[PDB]
Every structure is written in structure tokens, then in C-alpha cells.
Amino acid sequence: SSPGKPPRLVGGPMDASVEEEGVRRALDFAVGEYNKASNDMYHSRALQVVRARKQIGAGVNYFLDVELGRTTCTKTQPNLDNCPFHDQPHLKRKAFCSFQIYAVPWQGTMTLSKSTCQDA
């Protein structure tokens, strides 16, 4: 994720925009931990985030929902804006995943609490 403004935080559970750096770090972390951490069998990426929210309190739970897909392009290939733009209508089966990262705010750490997914 790029650096940025302090993210909008409020209290309790709240959705944060994809423009949020507080979201973007969790977004990239999720794919990085899910897809990139797994062996590259078929190129797959969080194509499109459907929901991006977090719980604010003594425990911080990030909830990110994502459409996964086999990407028409690769990590090194050009046009990363357009390839996933075309991957949504290419999703004959719309694969949806839910990623939950529990951030332990007391230590400034976080850990993926859940990763669940569908096939595309």
C-alpha cells in the first residue's frame, strides 16, 4: 500500500473506503497472504473489493470481501487497471472470498483470523 492521510476512524464497526490506507494495507496484506503466499498455479488476485470495513475498539477486526478470479494478465504484465476490469465480466462463476484480519491493537500487530474463498 502507498502511504497516505490518517485513515478515517470513528468507533465501533464502520466501513472504510478503498481509498483508505487503513483498508489498502489490509487489502494488499490479504492477497499477499492468501494468493501470493500460496503457490502460483493460476494467476489470481483480489480483483475487486466488494466490502471493506473494520471494528474499532479494544480488539480491531478488519473484514474485507473480495471477488477473486483467474486474471487475464500477470503480476509483471502491463495494464493492471484494465485486466481486472475485464476479469469481472469474465467471471463465469463469481468467486467470492471473505478475509478477516484481527489486529491486536495492544501490540500494534495483526494476524489473519480467517481466509475463506470460492472457485472461479
Curated annotation (Swiss-Prot):
The keyword Transport does not apply. It is found in: Secreted. Expressed in submandibular and sublingual saliva but not in parotid saliva (at protein level). Expressed in various body fluids, such as the cerebrospinal fluid and plasma. Expressed in highest levels in the epididymis, vas deferens, brain, thymus, and ovary and the lowest in the submandibular gland. Transmembrane segments: none annotated. Coiled coil: none annotated. The record marks 11 as: Reactive site. Disulfide bonds join 73-83, 97-117. Its main location: secreted. A motif (Secondary area of contact) lies at residues 55-59. Keywords: Age-related macular degeneration, Amyloid, Amyloidosis, Disease variant, Disulfide bond, Glycoprotein, Phosphoprotein, Protease inhibitor, Secreted, Signal, Thiol protease inhibitor. Belongs to the cystatin family. Homodimer. Potential cerebrospinal fluid marker for the diagnosis of Creutzfeldt-Jakob disease. It is linked to Cerebral amyloid angiopathy, CST3-related: An autosomal dominant disorder characterized by cystatin C amyloid accumulation in the walls of arteries, arterioles, and sometimes capillaries and veins of the brain, and in various organs including lymphoid tissue, spleen, salivary glands, and seminal vesicles. Amyloid deposition in the cerebral vessels results in intracranial hemorrhage and premature stroke. Cystatin C levels in the cerebrospinal fluid are abnormally low. As an inhibitor of cysteine proteinases, this protein is thought to serve an important physiological role as a local regulator of this enzyme activity. This is Cystatin-C. The lineage of its organism: Eukaryota, Metazoa, Chordata, Craniata, Vertebrata.
